Design a binder for this molecule. Structure first.
Ligand SMILES: Nc1ccn([C@@H]2O[C@H](COP(=O)(O)OP(=O)(O)OP(=O)(O)O)[C@@H](O)[C@H]2O)c(=O)n1
Ligand SMILES: Nc1ccn([C@@H]2O[C@H](COP(=O)(O)OP(=O)(O)OP(=O)(O)O)[C@@H](O)[C@H]2O)c(=O)n1
Ligand SMILES: O=C(O)C(=O)c1cn(-c2ccc(O)c(O)c2)c2ccc(-c3ccccc3)cc12
Ligand SMILES: O=C(O)C(=O)c1cn(-c2ccc(O)c(O)c2)c2ccc(-c3ccccc3)cc12
Ligand SMILES: O=C(O)C(=O)c1cn(-c2ccc(O)c(O)c2)c2ccc(-c3ccccc3)cc12
Ligand SMILES: O=C(O)C(=O)c1cn(-c2ccc(O)c(O)c2)c2ccc(-c3ccccc3)cc12
Ligand SMILES: [Ca+2]
Ligand SMILES: [Ca+2]
Lengths: 209, 211
């Protein structure tokens, strides 16, 4: 059936790329594929889905989904900021670069005979939790974060991050943590099995509110 | 038709990735497409082709080609050192990072000092001139030049040909240029990857019958 009908969902997926110059950048190895499966499952279940995609050019756009393409952690931030006020659910599956080149060159860098000075990018997810706390996001019912974790075990850092981020749900790479104390293990199955579990926890959270 | 039959060709393509830690790296936006097409056109004309591939645009291994996948500029260097004694033709199409982080972290990191990576094309030219690659008949380099306030595309293409010392330098104007070590400069007319890959290999085969 269709448990996400009427639900407007904003999802980010993939890594961002922080440009050093026109051609080079700082990036990561994340694939974006678990984020895409969640966007896809959500649309399969009736949600009106907008997907902000980073470094995911080899992936198939999920059917029924509004595509928004970004490169950078700041571009991801502004795309979320543009699309956040109208959505009911936000899923932050993207590996958002926490740092950026301090200055980006306008032409291909060719050095002498060196270093990269860095500056910090905004925590988009924490900006979203905050904006809802300040009354800026009245349509928002569920903020979902992502974490790959492994001085404590996988669960020391996962609760510690759930608390620190102040969001409704944290999906850990597996575990699924709610801001109301519940935790469900994620048996290591396919990405479609995972995505379904994630969307069931979402609808369950939406219904609990 | 099958002019390249019997020619052992070593090809690099893609962009290297310089790790900062197990998940993050420095990279570039090179697709690998023109270098794969060269390696394909080379194979379809009879050459026995080895392709050392960095990061590409999801490109599939060309059929008939021996594949070596690498990550970093240093790994690219090691794989070229390994395979170059067999080759008769080296085609350096990869974008090889000229810098890497001085320290790679053993776990997700929670300024980046850079140190320089070796010039692999230049180490090839020096090695053949020192007599360590008797089988190597042709060393091809690639370049993507834009032209600026100091010189047009060709001004920069000429300086790079002379600095590097290779037999042929394929220049994409960011048309384009094919510059030979005898001073011949042929324009690269616009085309698809396959058409231009045929022009590049044409150029290699003319250089080889000329030697
Ligand atoms: N600038 C950032 C960084 C992260 N995220 C979000 O925060 C969550 C992951 O946070 P985090 O665990 O801090 O990512 P890491 O940088 O890998 O974590 P850590 O600092 O603990 O290593 C994800 O939903 C991601 O989309 C974000 O919105 N903005
Ligand atoms: N460390 C390097 C850098 C470049 N290359 C090869 O050298 C050729 C020229 O690449 P390019 O980056 O233009 O050479 P640089 O002189 O390093 O470039 P720039 O002028 O931008 O500094 C290419 O075929 C490339 O595969 C290489 O073998 N090893
Ligand atoms: O969607 C993907 O496959 C992707 O690329 C991911 C990127 N991150 C991510 C986010 C924030 C970070 O700070 C960071 O280092 C990495 C993920 C975190 C978790 C998961 C995941 C969750 C549950 C089950 C399986 C996998 C998937 C990804
Ligand atoms: O210097 C060169 O000629 C030079 O190739 C580079 C200089 N940088 C660079 C940038 C910003 C800095 O702050 C700085 O110190 C140095 C680079 C960064 C990345 C790469 C690269 C990485 C992967 C594939 C291909 C190329 C190459 C260079
Ligand atoms: O194979 C590809 O298409 C690829 O990805 C390339 C990577 N470089 C490259 C190498 C060294 C650099 O420093 C750098 O910035 C980039 C290329 C240079 C030229 C060409 C090319 C040549 C002739 C016609 C069309 C394209 C293609 C590539
Ligand atoms: O600190 C963190 O938690 C943290 O996320 C990072 C710290 N660095 C970093 C590395 C080398 C350095 O020399 C240094 O000063 C700081 C990063 C570099 C890249 C990324 C990144 C880029 C794209 C997507 C996802 C992540 C994330 C971090
Ligand atoms: Ca360089
Ligand atoms: Ca971090």
């Amino acid at each position: 059936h269709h448990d996400m009908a009427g639900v407007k969902a904003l999802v980010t997926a993939g890594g961002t790329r922080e440009p050093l110059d026109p051609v080079r950048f700082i990036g990561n190895r994340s694939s974006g594929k678990q984020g895409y499966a969640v966007a896809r499952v959500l649309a399969q279940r009736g949600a009106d889905v907008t997907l902000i995609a980073g470094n995911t050019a080899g992936l198939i756009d999920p059917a029924g989904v509004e595509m928004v393409h970004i490169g950078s952690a700041t571009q991801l931030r502004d795309a979320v900021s543009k699309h956040a006020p109208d959505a009911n659910v936000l899923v932050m599956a993207a590996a958002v670069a926490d740092f950026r080149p301090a200055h980006v060159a306008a032409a291909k860098i060719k050095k002498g005979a060196s270093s990269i000075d860095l500056v910090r990018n905004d925590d988009v997810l924490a900006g979203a939790v905050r904006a809802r706390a300040d009354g800026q996001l009245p349509n928002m019912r569920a903020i979902v974060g992502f974490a790959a974790e492994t001085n404590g075990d996988v669960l020391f850092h996962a609760r510690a991050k759930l608390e620190r981020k102040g969001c409704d749900l944290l999906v850990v790479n597996g575990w699924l943590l709610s801001a109301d104390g519940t935790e469900s293990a994620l048996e290591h199955g396919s990405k479609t099995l995972m995505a379904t579990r994630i969307v069931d926890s979402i609808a369950a959270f939406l219904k609990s509110q």
